[PDB]
Design a protein around this motif. Structure first.
Motif, short mmCIF file in Angstrom:
data_model
loop_
_atom_site.label_atom_id
_atom_site.label_comp_id
_atom_site.label_asym_id
_atom_site.label_seq_id
_atom_site.Cartn_x
_atom_site.Cartn_y
_atom_site.Cartn_z
N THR A 16 15.92 -31.99 72.14
CA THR A 16 14.87 -32.24 71.18
C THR A 16 14.95 -33.66 70.65
O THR A 16 15.98 -34.33 70.77
N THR A 18 13.61 -36.49 67.32
CA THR A 18 13.13 -36.65 65.96
C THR A 18 12.80 -38.11 65.72
O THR A 18 13.32 -39.00 66.40
N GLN A 32 20.74 -29.87 60.21
CA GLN A 32 19.73 -28.83 60.01
C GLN A 32 19.34 -28.01 61.24
O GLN A 32 19.38 -26.79 61.20
N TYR A 33 18.93 -28.69 62.30
CA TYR A 33 18.42 -28.00 63.48
C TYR A 33 19.48 -27.14 64.17
O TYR A 33 19.23 -25.99 64.55
N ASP A 36 19.91 -23.86 61.60
CA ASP A 36 18.83 -22.96 62.03
C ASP A 36 19.10 -22.28 63.36
O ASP A 36 18.66 -21.17 63.60
N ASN A 37 19.79 -22.96 64.27
CA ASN A 37 19.99 -22.36 65.57
C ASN A 37 21.42 -21.88 65.78
O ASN A 37 21.85 -21.65 66.90
N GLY A 38 22.14 -21.73 64.67
CA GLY A 38 23.50 -21.21 64.67
C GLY A 38 24.43 -21.85 65.68
O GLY A 38 25.27 -21.17 66.27
#
Length: 56
Positions: A16, A18, A32-33, A36-38
């Protein structure tokens, strides 16, 4: 600029991007990302390629 996150996890895999002013903003999105995606792995960053890598 555009910063990249390469995810090499057990179950999560991908790449990904940013838009950030600096990499130390980009890290605090990606790190963060990856929450959220453990994702819990080892992180590296390469300035030449503006790319983060995290490897479970």
């Amino acid at each position: 600029d555009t910063y990249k996150l390469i995810l090499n996890g057990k179950t999560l895999k991908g790449e990904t991007t940013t838009e950030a002013v600096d990499a130390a903003t980009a890290e605090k999105v990606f790190k963060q990302y990856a929450x959220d995606n453990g994702v819990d792995g080892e992180w590296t960053y390469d300035d030449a390629t503006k790319t983060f890598t995290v490897t479970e």
